[PDB]
Assembly symmetry: C2
Homo-oligomer: 149 residues x 2
Amino acid sequence: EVQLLKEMPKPKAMTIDPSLSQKEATEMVHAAQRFYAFWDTGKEELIPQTVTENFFDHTLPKGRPQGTEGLKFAAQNFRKIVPNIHCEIEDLLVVGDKVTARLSFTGTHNDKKIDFFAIDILHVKDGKITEDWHLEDNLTLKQQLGLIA
Amino acid sequence: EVQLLKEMPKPKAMTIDPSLSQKEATEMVHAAQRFYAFWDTGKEELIPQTVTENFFDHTLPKGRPQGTEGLKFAAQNFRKIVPNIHCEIEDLLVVGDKVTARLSFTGTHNDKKIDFFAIDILHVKDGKITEDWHLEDNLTLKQQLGLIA
């Protein structure tokens, strides 16, 4: 099995392609753990450790910068609305060069509880994320924030 | 290699766990194809060929009934507002008993282009989908429909 990184989010459920070597599988699981540790903590030093310099978001939210600068922007922004935001990995699916993560995000926005999920697909090369497709339940989040319905 | 079913959405890209037998990989891909054929067409006769009778959506949109009856509801309900709608499979990731699908939905509404994406995680047992976790970019859609700013 893969030895998970301590002090970073541990997947609640996981499926790993067994044709991957121990080194390969570890580095893919490790990349995802760093990515979600970044979303859980906002520690910007994790960015160059986790994604490549040419990181590309195929599902770029409106007004988020493309690339690594967009990751900084997004994490700070999420912390503006939800200062105590927390990210957990519900399920992690690792195959070939791809990783699917299903995430749960929780916290408080002033006097309102926040609770929404997300699903991401990561392309991982040599232990770093080169590109992603991701989606958060933005309608649920906007309602919870008091912005909609 | 998997021999895809004709006259149903074909994945534009796929990654399949090498450890799955041809038969195991094929029945998982075919369930995905039938599932997105149903979303593309609304043909209810696909449902019992695709999902188990006790199918369970873990991430049920507000207003959607649970189970197979909710699949039928959703297909009809969507076409009342956007009948010119089409579903394509952008990417399919197949590993263990799980399938991740990334979808593109395109069409028109009034004199405007509809174009949004979804990501689904499917649990497949013996060639049928037993449960899922999925997210459609509904905020983007509502924006395209002129409902949300």
